Design a protein around this ligand. Structure first.
Ligand SMILES: *[C@@H]1O[C@H](CO)[C@@H](O[C@@H]2O[C@H](CO)[C@@H](O[C@@H]3O[C@H](CO)[C@@H](O)[C@H](O)[C@@H]3O)[C@H](O)[C@H]2NC(C)=O)[C@H](O)[C@H]1NC(C)=O
Ligand SMILES: *[C@@H]1O[C@H](CO)[C@@H](O[C@@H]2O[C@H](CO)[C@@H](O)[C@H](O)[C@H]2NC(C)=O)[C@H](O)[C@H]1NC(C)=O
Ligand SMILES: *[C@@H]1O[C@H](CO)[C@@H](O[C@@H]2O[C@H](CO)[C@@H](O)[C@H](O)[C@H]2NC(C)=O)[C@H](O)[C@H]1NC(C)=O
Ligand SMILES: *[C@@H]1O[C@H](CO)[C@@H](O[C@@H]2O[C@H](CO)[C@@H](O)[C@H](O)[C@H]2NC(C)=O)[C@H](O)[C@H]1NC(C)=O
Ligand SMILES: *[C@@H]1O[C@H](CO)[C@@H](O[C@@H]2O[C@H](CO)[C@@H](O)[C@H](O)[C@H]2NC(C)=O)[C@H](O)[C@H]1NC(C)=O
Ligand SMILES: *[C@@H]1O[C@H](CO)[C@@H](O[C@@H]2O[C@H](CO)[C@@H](O)[C@H](O)[C@H]2NC(C)=O)[C@H](O)[C@H]1NC(C)=O
Ligand SMILES: *[C@@H]1O[C@H](CO)[C@@H](O[C@@H]2O[C@H](CO)[C@@H](O)[C@H](O)[C@H]2NC(C)=O)[C@H](O)[C@H]1NC(C)=O
Ligand SMILES: *[C@@H]1O[C@H](CO)[C@@H](O[C@@H]2O[C@H](CO)[C@@H](O)[C@H](O)[C@H]2NC(C)=O)[C@H](O)[C@H]1NC(C)=O
Ligand SMILES: *[C@@H]1O[C@H](CO)[C@@H](O)[C@H](O)[C@H]1NC(C)=O
Ligand SMILES: *[C@@H]1O[C@H](CO)[C@@H](O)[C@H](O)[C@H]1NC(C)=O
Ligand SMILES: *[C@@H]1O[C@H](CO)[C@@H](O)[C@H](O)[C@H]1NC(C)=O
Ligand SMILES: *[C@@H]1O[C@H](CO)[C@@H](O)[C@H](O)[C@H]1NC(C)=O
Ligand SMILES: *[C@@H]1O[C@H](CO)[C@@H](O)[C@H](O)[C@H]1NC(C)=O
Ligand SMILES: *[C@@H]1O[C@H](CO)[C@@H](O)[C@H](O)[C@H]1NC(C)=O
Ligand SMILES: *[C@@H]1O[C@H](CO)[C@@H](O)[C@H](O)[C@H]1NC(C)=O
Ligand SMILES: *[C@@H]1O[C@H](CO)[C@@H](O)[C@H](O)[C@H]1NC(C)=O
Lengths: 200, 728, 728
């Protein structure tokens, strides 16, 4: 059949920790229409021409709400709190990232705000005084995802849940911050692909 | 012969103690209010020059109450229409008067019913709270900027403390903390939504025919505590076209397990703030040190910078955890924590290294840290002659910790033994405020070479008036008991001989970390009782009294009313077997917690005591507030400590009151210890059928500080004591 | 010297006055409950039958305190789970027990927390009030029919009265009035929406850690008052398929111009009712008589049928305007109407005639009509020997008004002088309950020939056990002060001698239309004080006392707290000048109004009295409720009576309290005279600076009726009296 980037523009976008992997366009792959409707703000990854033309095997996508006023924590090399807790870039496959801004047209629906976990550490000990942060894999979700994955209402929201064994056996504390809503919605597009059916 | 200290002299305050209250405004200049005139004084020379005139403020139709000075000296802040709300909180009107233009600023006045106004430490920035909202003025003749929009009456408190925090945690109405150079404003937000209220009727003046009912958010023992949040707002980036953004600093995740408190906030340097948090089970506290980054403008508190204080035997701190004292660079600080032996001493702390090195050691407790410079550190301790009552000033050398110099040990050994200090801005000068066995003496010193500059006050005319009149004499000693010295005081009558037996009134507080045998000169009701009626008034420091190590203080942990009561009874027994005390005329009286101790001693059935007064006593620990009761008893949860919660009631000992005479006094409009408590005591006493005396004082707070009510209550107490002792 | 009437004898009720309480179910018979068994007594021949046994009582799972009998005798109503709310109001649970089947009814039982249940006068119709809504059951085993849908807690009362009407106007909790044969149900609906609320805290048992607040609609003096409506529903046309409807009988046109009350409701004949309305300015009352209209289905009231009672010199009636006593045909009625001279007497009325002809005349007052069959009218009056303190039963022939016979004057002149009577259904038999100077004696009489059939109770055992105690005497006499006869009573100690001087305690009530000098046998605190402490307890009837003419009673109109105070002072002066009263040991005590009179006497500065007790006194008349204050003082508008409202306060004369000893006792949960009044008294007394004693009684009503608190308060007043009089 014929497939394209239709499921990315439906409903409300999720946040950076609540990221949605999707695998589609197996038979045919469509080029330069998601970039046409949603303009690009930067393109630097470890080229547009190499990912534009050339057949592939399996293409995956990543999209989440990500403001442009804060961009520097997610780099190929960085020490941001978002990189260590929420999402880390995957380097196992040729991938490139894209930050997009919604135009004045209201094709997408805006969420309440942009939110992200500031602390996802594990509490363990006799008096629960030893603190150990939980770093996350680039291809795995943070364990603080179940603390309101829709979003955080205020800046200081903390939600705690006792972890199951088979996970560490300590109390988990998840604190999520929030940034104020901008004028228009803003998208973080990350595309990974590996080398044959997915061809333009 | 000569006259004695009468009750009229005490109530009318004829013999008035002269004080010298000065506020430092610079390195070497301080203010003084002499004859309703603000006077600038010089520390080095002593010459005084006039700062504010008489007529410059009385030209208005409202009499001023107090003055606040800007650090630059450009403006004076005057307050009037003073209305007291609680012990610390009040509402008043404010106005700003310029000193260069010498006129009043009526451009944008501070609105009426202002809750709390503070100046910036430098410059002339203002931060006043109105309707539980934070307003900041860069200049007094400029429009104000609104910081918090979520303030609400008795629900959300922004920048001002609620009832429980003001009474116990912060001991103040202020929750605003400026940066050291007046750039960042730090405020705390208190949420009171799920906390239950307390209702007491307020029968106002006779014109009003329907009494009002007061609603106070009051978390009792086992109730839900208020939720605290912490914010810091940058005041340099303020604009009138957009809302100010406040960056929230979250609590450490060790405290996010359950309920927690914010107990101390201290600014380290211009971009670093140190927060101290206290758990609901007040035996585990962590200090959070947060830095301000420039890349994001978010306050980051590293895990490695957290410092953990815990107590395995009792509660951390004396009442609240002690504040740190940072150095100039802010990379290290000095803090007072308990050592391995159980005595509070000073640790040199590093903001990155967890361990502390003790710089003081011994069998004495460091009372507090007063001033820190790069060369020396000044502190107050009770080391000198080993008396826990006495206080003296010591300075230690930061380079060599074994060289300790005392600055108030030998200034006046027979007169001044309880010293208090007040350093300058650079701590170049300190005014010593002794209040020892003699009259209070106020001296001014310079810290460059510890030379006495002059004497500010010595109460000469008061000395003549007191040498005219017969006055009681104090006596400080101790008893051995269970191989641990316990100190006591006795206000002996004039011309006191051991052969004649005197009646005893055991003035008792016996609270946790309370001192009642200090060398402090006071003109109180006990001086009238000793001087006129010839009554030995005594106080005791049993188990739970502070400044004597954690072994004594923490013996009363999770058990109130069973140990200090036994120590008070034992002290009465020892006093009776001293020889000069009539055993048949021993009484007991106390205030608040002292009333609870008095009620428990009378209900213990020991038979030592004849009559007892308990003004505003504590009855059941499930009626007092959450912080104070849970610090020393824990939650009233029936798997943890409900047995001692239900065993430590006065009403369980109501049958034993038949052998003693009880006088129960309480205020109807009390907010600290409610009228419910004395209502329950009276209900138990009339259900058992015990004859007792009672008295209620309407529209009276816990202090009962109104002059007519104070005179009436002390006259009634004197009448009850005289009728109990059958004094001529 | 045998034993005396001790305090514990009064407190523990060792000497119990035996009561013979009976209820007539028919002309012939009556029921007397004895040994927890119900017995039918045939009044002619004795004939002690049985009605209920112990088996019904112990077969149920809960205790039963009160019973009610259906008039046909086929059902008994049992009351359990008694929870008292006010003086007359209560809530309880009910169940109907059939007697024909000897089984308990289990279908559609009366719901829990039912405010008021009443039986129909004939048949077995049952109407009860639950959640301020009226439910009518034709049969006890049938579902109820809802009458009112507008019931609301503390807002709208249907079939029951609110606080003010129950306390003052109706003196009962029942606002339901059945038709004479149980066809119509007439109820009054009360609106409480603009009535301001009183709020006093309620400290419950020790488990409750937060005191509840009691919210009561309490119309104070000059405030908004409840609005009363009237309705009549038809129980014969009750159907479950549709809502029952009622017809509102409106007030007369002379009452709707201003605020009005509804004081008395009486079913005149089988199909007509006689409503009695009273103005807010309580000196103008109009009785409205309304007839049922069969053609229209509504109730019409004629202007010519209205009868107007007026009082120029003061208020109308004694407390409330008296109820009429209609004849059998309903074409005439008898009412107590004040004469032109002032004394209240029976006046024969007609429905369509304005004028009435008085049937009794003299310088005495008729207390009230009791019964009339067709030819004699039975009334109680104080005509005998010119004693307003004595009551006797009189009968008068209807045809010839000169024929007046006393049925209780000569029965026992030396023992009984205070008669109260209870009649049968057709008034052929009446039980005379004399409580005169002697012990209470109960007799049974037949009205046909006025012969004593038998005595029901004569207190033989109490007369046996009263020989071992020194009972106090009782002297009733008069003094002539202002050319008028003023009566007084004295409880004298045994072996009383005129030579020896005794202490005098003036037990004073002094309320408007209050008799304190009657010949009623009492076993109370005065008996203990006279017998044991040898204290003369005296009472006086000054200006404002009732049953002595309108000239004495209405002299206090619009001036409260002036003439009764000087009357009490002059009575004390006369008592001290008689000779047997010690002039330096005179005290005074009172309850409610008595406390107010005691407070104004002590604050008057007369100096006659030594000490005083005021148990729940009235302080300011703006604090007390609207009906009682406005009846004798008028509204406190600035242009009518505000001057004497602000001149007749206790707090205005607190300066003169320094010469006397004051004891101030008040219950915190008091709803009649709130704690606000004693709080204001205490505040004024500590503002002036007067030493006095006090005691609050938590969770206590106006009467202090709980046994432990009653014993404690009487022990404390005994201790205060003994200490004041310098007695052992
Ligand atoms: C101060 O504390 C109170 C509670 O102690 C806070 O009120 C709470 O506000 C949250 C919203 O942030 C409410 O949650 C909401 O509940 C509704 C109903 O269950 C639900 O439909 C929503 O999806 C949301 O979960 C919460 O119920 C409410 N709690 C109350 C009213 O007891 C209050 O927000 C705090 N103050 C500030 C300034 O945050
Ligand atoms: C602070 O006090 C709490 C209880 O008030 C202590 O917690 C208990 O410690 C014992 C020690 O074995 C355990 O058995 C209990 O299960 C603990 N209870 C709870 C609720 O945690 C605690 O040890 C104290 N000291 C700290 C926190 O340093
Ligand atoms: C600053 O914040 C406050 C609080 O959010 C804003 O005030 C509210 O604004 C909304 C939107 O106009 C109104 O619906 C509310 O009624 C306002 N509440 C109050 C109490 O005023 C305010 O508008 C903000 N100011 C700016 C400049 O954005
Ligand atoms: C008050 O202290 C603050 C905190 O350091 C100062 O703010 C910084 O000042 C430095 C230079 O001293 C600048 O490089 C930073 O950009 C400033 N940061 C911010 C957030 O303002 C401030 O300058 C000081 N004010 C005064 C008058 O000395
Ligand atoms: C109870 O009294 C009512 C009121 O009079 C009686 O009802 C009336 O009875 C007469 C006699 O038959 C009728 O003519 C009327 O139409 C009835 N009026 C109403 C409104 O019902 C009733 O009969 C009496 N009860 C008994 C059992 O006789
Ligand atoms: C009880 O009284 C209140 C007022 O005292 C009544 O409320 C009024 O109802 C009328 C409807 O006829 C409205 O026009 C008024 O505006 C209402 N006033 C207020 C203050 O609410 C209420 O209806 C009465 N209740 C009953 C059952 O009679
Ligand atoms: C009798 O009257 C009551 C009150 O007027 C009726 O109850 C109301 O019925 C309506 C629907 O018809 C509801 O919307 C209301 O909520 C009801 N009120 C209450 C207090 O229950 C009742 O339906 C009527 N019954 C008949 C048989 O007419
Ligand atoms: C009921 O009492 C009121 C007030 O006590 C009387 O009203 C006064 O009447 C006199 C004589 O007419 C006037 O001089 C006053 O101005 C009235 N006062 C007010 C406030 O209206 C009233 O007349 C009395 N009613 C009767 C029938 O005697
Ligand atoms: C100022 O007022 C005080 C007291 O009000 C008075 O003693 C003094 O003389 C006045 N003048 C100066 C210059 O202090
Ligand atoms: C005291 O005198 C010195 C000069 O000797 C002067 O500089 C100083 O300002 C004076 N102090 C005051 C407060 O006027
Ligand atoms: C405060 O009250 C006074 C008294 O009327 C008034 O003159 C003044 O304007 C008020 N303050 C403000 C800011 O309105
Ligand atoms: C404490 O209370 C419990 C139960 O209430 C009881 O078993 C125990 O004996 C009490 N301990 C005392 C009174 O010392
Ligand atoms: C019923 O019980 C009471 C006491 O409970 C007893 O005095 C009485 O004799 C009993 N009567 C019968 C008939 O059993
Ligand atoms: C007693 O009363 C019963 C019914 O109550 C009656 O049958 C009996 O005849 C009466 N005894 C007499 C009249 O002697
Ligand atoms: C009253 O309460 C009891 C127990 O609470 C219950 O058994 C009974 O059914 C209730 N009455 C009614 C009418 O529901
Ligand atoms: C009330 O007292 C005042 C005294 O200030 C007096 O002038 C006035 O006449 C009095 N009013 C009366 C007695 O009605």
């Amino acid at each position: 059949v014929e497939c394209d980037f239709t499921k990315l523009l439906s409903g409300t976008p999720p946040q950076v920790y609540n990221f949605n992997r999707l695998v589609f366009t197996n038979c045919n792959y469509n080029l330069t229409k998601l970039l046409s409707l949603f303009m690009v703000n930067e393109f630097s990854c470890d080229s547009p021409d190499a990912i534009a033309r050339g057949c592939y095997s399996s293409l995956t996508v990543d999209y989440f709400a990500y403001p442009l006023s804060m961009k520097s924590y997610m780099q190929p090399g960085s020490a941001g709190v978002i990189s260590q807790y929420n999402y880390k870039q995957s380097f196992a496959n040729p991938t490139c990232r894209i930050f997009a801004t919604a135009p004045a047209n209201l094709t997408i629906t805006k969420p309440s705000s942009y939110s992200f976990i500031s602390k996802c550490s594990r509490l363990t000990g006799d008096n629960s005084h030893i603190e150990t942060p939980i770093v996350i894999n680039p291809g795995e979700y943070s364990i603080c995802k179940n603390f309101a994955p829709n979003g955080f209402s205020q800046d200081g929201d903390y939600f705690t849940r006792q972890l199951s064994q088979l996970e560490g056996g300590g109390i988990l504390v998840g604190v999520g911050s929030v940034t104020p809503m901008t004028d228009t919605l803003q998208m973080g597009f990350i595309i990974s692909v590996q080398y044959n059916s997915v061809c333009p | 012969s000569r006259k004695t200290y009468t009750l009229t002299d005490y109530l009318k305050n004829t013999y008035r103690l002269k004080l010298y209250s000065l506020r430092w405004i610079s390195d070497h200049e301080y203010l003084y209010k002499q004859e309703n005139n603000i006077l600038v004084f010089n520390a080095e020379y002593g010459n005084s020059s006039v700062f504010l005139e008489n007529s410059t403020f009385d030209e208005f139709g409202h009499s001023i109450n107090d003055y606040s000075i800007s650090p630059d000296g450009q403006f004076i802040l005057l307050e009037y229409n003073y209305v007291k709300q609680w012990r610390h909180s009040y509402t008043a009107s404010y106005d700003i008067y310029d000193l260069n233009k010498r006129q009043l600023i009526t451009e944008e006045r501070i609105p009426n019913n202002t809750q709390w106004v503070t100046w910036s430490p430098v410059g002339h920035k203002l931060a006043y709270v109105w309707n539980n909202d934070i307003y900041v003025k860069i200049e007094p003749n400029l429009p104000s900027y609104r910081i918090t929009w979520t303030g609400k009456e008795d629900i959300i408190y922004n920048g001002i403390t609620d009832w429980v925090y003001e009474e116990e945690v912060f001991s103040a109405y202020s929750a605003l903390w400026w940066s050291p150079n007046g750039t960042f404003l730090a405020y705390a937000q208190f949420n009171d939504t799920e906390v239950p209220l307390i209702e007491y009727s307020f029968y106002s003046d006779e014109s009003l025919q329907y009494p009002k009912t007061v609603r106070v958010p009051y978390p009792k023992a086992g109730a839900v505590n208020p939720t605290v949040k912490f914010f810091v707002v940058n005041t340099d980036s303020l604009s009138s076209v957009t809302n100010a953004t406040s960056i929230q600093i979250t609590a450490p995740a060790s405290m996010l397990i359950g309920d927690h408190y914010l107990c101390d906030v201290t600014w380290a340097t211009q971009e670093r703030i140190s927060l101290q948090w206290l758990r609901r089970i007040q035996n585990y506290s962590v200090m959070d040190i947060c830095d301000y980054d420039e890349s994001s403008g978010r306050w980051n508190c590293l895990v490695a910078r957290q410092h953990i204080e815990m107590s395995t035997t009792g509660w951390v701190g004396r009442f609240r955890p002690s504040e740190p004292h940072f150095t100039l660079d802010g990379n290290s600080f000095y803090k007072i924590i308990s050592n391995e032996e159980g005595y509070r001493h000073i640790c040199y702390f590093q903001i990155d290294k967890k361990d502390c090195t003790f710089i003081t050691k011994g069998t004495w407790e460091v009372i507090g840290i007063e001033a820190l410079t790069s060369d020396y550190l000044y502190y107050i301790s009770n080391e000198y002659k080993g008396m826990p009552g006495g206080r003296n000033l010591y300075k230690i050398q930061l380079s060599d910790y074994t060289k300790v110099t005392c600055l108030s040990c030998e200034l006046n050994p027979e007169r001044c033994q309880y010293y208090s200090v007040s350093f300058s801005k650079e701590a170049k000068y300190y005014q010593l405020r002794c209040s020892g066995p003699g009259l209070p003496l106020y001296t001014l010193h310079s810290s460059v070479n510890d030379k006495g500059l002059r004497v500010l006050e010595d109460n000469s005319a008061l000395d003549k008036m007191l040498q005219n009149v017969q006055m009681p004499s104090k006596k400080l000693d101790f008893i051995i008991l269970n191989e641990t010295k316990f100190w006591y005081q006795m206000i002996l009558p004039p011309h006191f001989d051991k052969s004649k037996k005197y009646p005893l009134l055991l003035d008792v507080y016996a609270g946790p970390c309370s001192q009642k045998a200090d060398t402090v000169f006071r003109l109180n009701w006990a001086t009238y009782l000793a001087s006129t009626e010839n009554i030995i008034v005594a106080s005791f420091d049993g188990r739970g009294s502070g400044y004597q190590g954690d072994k004594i203080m923490h013996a009363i942990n999770r058990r109130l009313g069973t140990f200090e009561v036994e120590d008070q009874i034992e002290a009465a027994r020892q006093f009776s077997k001293m020889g000069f005390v009539d055993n048949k005329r021993i009484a007991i009286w106390g205030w608040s917690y002292g009333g609870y101790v008095t009620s428990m001693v009378l209900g213990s059935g020991s038979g030592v005591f004849k009559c007892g007064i308990a003004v505003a006593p504590v009855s059941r620990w499930e009626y007092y507030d959450s912080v104070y009761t849970e610090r020393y008893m824990g939650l009233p949860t029936p798997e943890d400590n409900l047995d001692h919660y239900r065993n430590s009631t006065v009403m369980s000992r109501a049958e034993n009151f038949k052998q003693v005479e009880y006088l129960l006094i309480h205020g109807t409009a009390d907010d600290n210890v409610h009228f419910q408590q004395s209502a329950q005591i009276s209900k138990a006493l009339v259900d058992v059928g015990v004859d007792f005396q009672a008295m209620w004082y309407t529209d009276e707070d816990h202090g009962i500080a109104s002059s007519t009510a104070h005179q009436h209550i002390y006259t009634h107490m004197s009448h009850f004591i005289k009728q109990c002792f059958s004094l001529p």
